[PDB]
């Protein structure tokens, strides 16, 4: 099959010379050996494998040469135009110029050194008249081009649907959301075959999605002896590279009206693997390339990535200022009016009690009563403030759900077991909005959190319990739109009193129309709308990231029992039992006593003490007393 040919305005000999000149000369001299040769000494020490080339370095080198009065033939345009070939040129230049190691390596421990040394010895035995390898085999590093900064096409972040066929071969940059990521798998750069009948190994480089394996020994050792020896693949000696695929999709906002969102395959190789995860919003530089399916399949060979997204001294800045529990509680959602006792309890759920051996240490609160009053925003704010938090609703989060299951990926054919929200909330806190509406499986799921700190599986031959140690924050908004504000909650709420008895505290709150409290609430709301800042004075609202310092710091200040608290909490239980000597389900029980103990331990954590304080017990009892008096309405 004969081919025609044409002359073109390029020369890879001249550009190879330019590339090695750049490599052996350039440094970032505006910041005042060469950057690239020093980096290649790091490669030679086996301390580095990711060789990054900046197009800005190439541009600075071109400008330096042009300033010195010689044309650099705009290597930036060439690499932005036919990027894939210049990977080969850059790697050949490196292989022709990389300096020897400085740090010791124990060089014989690499199989490639032993096998190529043996081939060299055999070739010297031949060479006494009695390439050595394909270079990709010996090439340990991975080479990537990094785009131009703003100052050019590689710099511009294209949406996926702007990637047209004319860009094929160019080092473009794309922008979107990763909708799927592959597990890592190895791919052969060079296959190494042993030869059974002579021991002289032979090599095949692979440069496509498929190949055909070798059979007969092509080496002169066999071929000259006309000895038709058989070849066997060795994974020990074959060079593999890490491979991974990711599907990028344009952002949902970029989709024109009525169009389907367009998507693309990104292939990533070498050390750059597992730089991406699903749900990431990211800019990725790569070579936009065809693949064998006249319509070609197409993908992006990734090259560079831009994701869109001490303390133990710094906590002292808030500790030294004092009254930090009261202030931090007042910092919980300062845009929400009042209810400071509720906020003070919700903080203790993040701080937590003691678990011991078992003794169960999580702390749980239920909000109950009329809808609105910024409650859903408070639960969302808790999910924002708290570390290891998650927000749900009794019917929401309706994908993987709050309740766990065995599952397929029905878009493909494999099966997997995966956890629901209660497992993500493990070692943390789960917020249940619309708590009144959750079903029997959901209710038994939160039962299993409270009764085993797990969620169970009994399906498709798999019996397993997944770990779910987590605090519950919950919102039981009533039936029929409004509570009847003189009745027991069970005349207003769907949920069984059995479930409610497991919570450490319950706050019934009613949306009472009352001119005076209406005006106090309305003054707060209107002031927040008017002033745009400081939702109240003297609250000292701490910002989320700064208070996470103290929440994490407080969480680890585990207490030890004091005999004073042991007596005092026994007395506190007996005092509340006198009130229990009866008109609602807020009775004193061992679980309320445990709630007081855990709330007290969380207060001991917050006051940074080892000895738990009778003050902690009395304040824990105060929150329980306010809770019961709230429940009594």
């Amino acid at each position: 099959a004969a081919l025609p040919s044409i002359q073109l305005p390029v020369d890879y000999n001249n550009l190879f010379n330019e590339i090695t000149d750049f490599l052996v000369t350039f440094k970032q001299d505006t910041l005042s050996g060469p950057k690239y040769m020093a980096m290649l000494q790091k490669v030679a020490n086996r301390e580095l494998n990711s060789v990054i080339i900046d197009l800005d370095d190439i541009l600075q080198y071109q400008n330096e040469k042009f300033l010195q009065g010689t044309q650099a033939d705009d290597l930036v345009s060439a690499i932005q135009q036919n990027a894939n070939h210049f990977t080969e040129l850059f790697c050949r230049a490196i292989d022709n110029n990389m300096p020897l190691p400085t740090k010791e390596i124990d060089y014989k421990d690499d199989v490639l050194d032993v096998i190529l040394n043996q081939r060299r010895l055999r070739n010297e035995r031949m060479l006494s008249d009695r390439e050595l390898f394909p270079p990709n085999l010996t090439r340990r590093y991975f080479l990537y081009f990094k785009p131009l900064s703003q100052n050019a096409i590689s710099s511009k972040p294209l949406s996926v649907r702007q990637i047209k066929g004319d860009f094929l071969g160019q080092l473009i940059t794309v922008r979107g959301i990763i909708t799927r990521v592959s597990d890592v798998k190895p791919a052969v750069e060079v296959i190494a075959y042993t030869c059974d009948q002579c021991g002289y190994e032979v090599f095949q480089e692979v440069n496509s999605r498929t190949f055909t394996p070798l059979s007969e020994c092509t080496s002169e050792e066999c071929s000259q002896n006309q000895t038709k020896g058989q070849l066997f693949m060795s994974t020990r000696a074959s060079k593999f590279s890490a491979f991974q695929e990711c599907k990028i999709q344009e952002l949902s906002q970029q989709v024109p009206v009525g169009h389907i969102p367009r998507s693309l395959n990104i292939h990533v190789n070498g050390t750059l693997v597992r730089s991406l995860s699903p749900g990431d919003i990211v800019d990725v530089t790569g070579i936009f390339l065809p693949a064998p399916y006249l319509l070609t399949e197409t993908y992006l060979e990734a090259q560079f990535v831009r994701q869109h997204k001490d303390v133990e001294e710094r906590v002292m800045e808030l500790i030294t200022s004092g009254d930090v529990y009261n202030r931090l509680a007042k910092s919980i959602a300062p845009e929400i009016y009042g209810n400071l006792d509720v906020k003070k309890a919700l903080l203790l759920l993040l701080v937590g009690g003691v678990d011991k051996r078992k003794i169960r240490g999580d702390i749980n609160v239920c909000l109950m009563g009329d809808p609105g009053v910024a409650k859903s925003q408070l639960l969302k704010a808790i999910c924002k403030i708290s570390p290891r938090g998650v927000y749900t609703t009794g019917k929401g989060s309706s994908g993987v759900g709050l309740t766990a299951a065995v599952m397929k990926d029905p878009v493909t054919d494999e099966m997997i077991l995966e956890g629901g929200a209660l497992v993500l909330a493990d070692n943390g806190i789960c917020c249940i909005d619309e708590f009144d509406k959750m079903d029997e499986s959901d209710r038994t799921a939160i039962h299993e959190v409270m009764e085993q700190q797990t969620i169970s599986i009994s399906k498709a031959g798999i019996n397993t319990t997944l770990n779910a140690r987590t605090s519950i924050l919950a919102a039981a908004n009533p039936l029929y739109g409004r509570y009847n504000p003189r009745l027991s909650p069970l005349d207003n709420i769907n949920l069984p009193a059995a479930l409610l008895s497991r919570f450490d505290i319950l706050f019934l709150m009613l949306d009472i129309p009352s001119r005076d409290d209406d005006e106090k609430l309305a003054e707060h709301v209107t002031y927040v709308h008017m002033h745009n800042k400081q939702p109240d004075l003297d609250f000292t609202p701490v910002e989320p990231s700064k208070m996470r310092e103290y929440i994490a710091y407080a969480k680890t200040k585990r207490p030890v029992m004091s005999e004073a608290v042991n007596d005092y909490v026994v007395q506190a239980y007996i005092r509340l039992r006198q009130d229990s000597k009866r008109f609602s389900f807020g009775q004193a029980t061992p679980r309320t006593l445990l709630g007081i103990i855990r709330l007290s331990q969380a207060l001991a954590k917050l006051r940074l003490a080892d000895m738990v304080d009778i003050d902690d017990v009395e304040e824990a009892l105060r929150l329980v007393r306010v809770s019961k008096e709230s429940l009594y309405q």
């Binding site: 032993v114 394996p213 077991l417 497992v423 031959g461 006198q578």
Partner: protein, 595 residues
């Protein structure tokens, strides 16, 4: 002047590797490991000065078993074998071949050194395996990379499922179509080295050999899907999974739902673009090729069996963290013992219902009992379907109760469960099996579970001015299915409330109680103690039932008394029922039947 056997690609002499391993396989003392690791202060001559792997090889020879389990860290203790640990981790197939052959060689060496009467022919026939383990850090499944591809690795994970056993040809068998001569070929790297001409020179016909499939010799292979645990994931995205190949008697060493370690060589293989072609896809499949697996006596038992407080001693141990409630704990202890069985129907089960308020600790007692029992289940009854609890639909899969076959089934919220689901539990309590008949599915599904129900009075509180039937609202004959029924109530009393609060608050002070010994003792009792009934028990059984029958009772109470008396007779390893067992069974029933 001589050839050298070299591990290919490594310059390791195999002969030197062999000697370096042999001199550790014999003459190694387990004290050397305590010199290598922590707990060096606890060297003890009578357990550490033995030639430890010769102790293993001799016990292994007496049992005649092929496997030597080998903790990899032991190689680093012995001076001549430290390098061989690194050789193993980096070149495991060859070093393991060496270790296998050396174990077989040492079995021969021991019988010929001792010039023993044990069969040399047995040792020569037997294949021998080393199973190396505890290689190093259990690096994550997500973290494996191309450098690992020939190394030994160790992974923690969850088994999703397994294949059936798969036959793998180890030797081919070729028979001549002309002259009926036969020859054997070992399979080399998955390739049949077929003879092109017949072996016999007096025949020597080409292409005359044919493969006699069922006279070939086969090893066993099994493939298992091992998942990254949901505990270790970055929780915003899925767990991974990896296929593993497991071989010979390591087949079926684990099952779906097992969390395990697997130690093996990491491996990779190409996969064909089309089976009609040699063409291969560029990215290889990967799997781990396993060499070891792990999950996640009577003298002591006899010493405890002589104690006089043993009834209370075992009763406290089930839940010392909860208030002592020792009639409940004693009843549960009898439920853990169980009765006996007779095949001519009846079963040696025991069934209990915890009534009382929702405001009490009975759920926590159920939680501990579910931990204590070997093979129980826990669930709850509100909204519990008659088929979901039992078995559900193509194939039928077992539900919670059937999965609790041979163990305690804890069910909370039992008072809220619908009469349909109770109607299924009728034949559990009466026959301990489920008599299904649906479209395509007819079966008597055996499910021998000792139910431990937890139930409540209807509404927020028990009414003390009413009997338990009028409170619980479940009908009387349903309560008569259970052996014991209990009230645990939240009623205010400053004495009980002080002592309970003290009992609970004492938990934070302190640094047979432990469940491990309790469940061992219950297990040994189940294996060893099967009480027969004496006439001194018969007389009180007949009398006591006739008493409560004219208190008004049924033979289900008498059968309950029999099963409880047999359970009581498993205490003190008594193994014979007598009057006192019946008296306590009857007496605890008198606490219940008052209603």
């Amino acid at each position: 002047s001589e050839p050298l056997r070299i591990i290919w690609g490594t310059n390791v002499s195999i002969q030197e590797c062999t000697t370096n391993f042999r001199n550790f396989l014999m003459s190694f003392k387990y004290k050397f490991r305590k010199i290598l690791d922590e707990r060096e202060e606890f060297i003890n001559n009578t357990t550490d000065e033995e030639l430890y792997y010769i102790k293993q090889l001799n016990e292994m020879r007496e049992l005649g078993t092929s496997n030597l389990n080998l903790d990899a860290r032991n190689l680093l203790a012995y001076k001549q074998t430290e390098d061989l640990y690194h050789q193993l981790l980096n070149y495991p197939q060859e070093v393991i071949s060496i270790m296998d052959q050396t174990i077989k060689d040492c079995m021969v060496s021991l019988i010929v050194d001792n010039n023993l009467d044990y069969d040399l022919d047995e040792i020569e026939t037997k294949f021998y395996k080393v199973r190396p383990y505890n290689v190093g850090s259990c690096k994550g499944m997500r973290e494996l990379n191309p450098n690992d591809i020939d190394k030994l690795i160790n992974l923690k994970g969850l088994v999703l499922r397994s294949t059936p056993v798969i036959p793998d040809m180890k030797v081919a068998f070729f028979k001549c179509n002309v002259c009926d001569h036969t020859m054997a070929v070992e399979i080399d790297r998955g390739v049949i080295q077929e003879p092109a001409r017949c072996e016999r020179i007096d025949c020597n016909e080409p292409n005359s050999m044919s493969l006699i499939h069922n006279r070939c010799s086969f090893a066993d292979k099994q493939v298992i899907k091992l998942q990254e645990t949901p505990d270790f994931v970055p929780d915003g995205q899925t767990p991974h999974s990896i296929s593993l190949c497991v071989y010979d008697e390591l087949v079926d060493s684990c099952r779906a739902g097992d969390r395990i370690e697997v130690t093996g060589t990491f491996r990779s293989i190409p996969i064909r673009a089309n089976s009609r072609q040699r063409v291969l896809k560029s990215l290889y499949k990967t799997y781990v090729d396993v060499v070891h697996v792990k999950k996640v006596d009577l003298a002591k038992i006899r010493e405890v069996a002589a104690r006089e407080d043993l009834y209370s001693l075992l009763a406290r141990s089930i839940a010392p963290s909860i208030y002592e409630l020792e009639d409940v704990k004693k009843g549960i202890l009898l439920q853990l013992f169980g009765g006996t069985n007779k095949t001519f129907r009846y079963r040696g089960d025991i069934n209990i219902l915890l009534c009382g308020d929702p405001s009490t600790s009975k759920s926590q007692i159920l939680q501990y009992v579910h931990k204590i029992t070997p093979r129980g289940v826990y669930t709850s009854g509100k909204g519990s379907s008659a088929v979901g609890l039992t078995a559900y639909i193509l194939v039928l899969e077992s539900g919670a109760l059937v999965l609790s076959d041979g163990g305690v089934c804890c069910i909370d919220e039992f008072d809220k469960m619908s009469d349909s689901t109770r109607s299924v539990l009728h034949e559990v309590m009466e026959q301990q099996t489920i008599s299904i008949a649906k479209a395509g599915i007819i079966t008597t599904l055996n499910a021998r579970s000792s139910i431990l129900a937890s139930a409540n009075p209807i509404g927020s509180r028990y009414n003390p001015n009413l009997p338990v039937t009028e409170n619980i609202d479940l009908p009387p004959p349903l309560l008569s299915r259970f052996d014991l029924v209990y009230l645990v109530l939240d009623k205010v009393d400053e004495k009980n409330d002080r002592e309970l609060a003290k009992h609970l608050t004492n938990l934070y002070l302190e640094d047979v109680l432990p469940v491990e010994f309790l469940t061992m003792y219950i297990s040994y009792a189940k294996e060893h103690i099967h009480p027969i009934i004496t006439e001194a028990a018969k007389t009180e059984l007949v009398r006591a039932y006739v008493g409560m029958r004219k208190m008004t009772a049924t033979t289900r109470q008498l059968e309950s008394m029999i099963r409880l008396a047999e359970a009581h007779a498993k205490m003190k390893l008594k193994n014979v029922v007598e009057l006192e067992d019946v008296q306590e069974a009857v007496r605890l029933i008198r606490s219940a039947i008052k209603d």
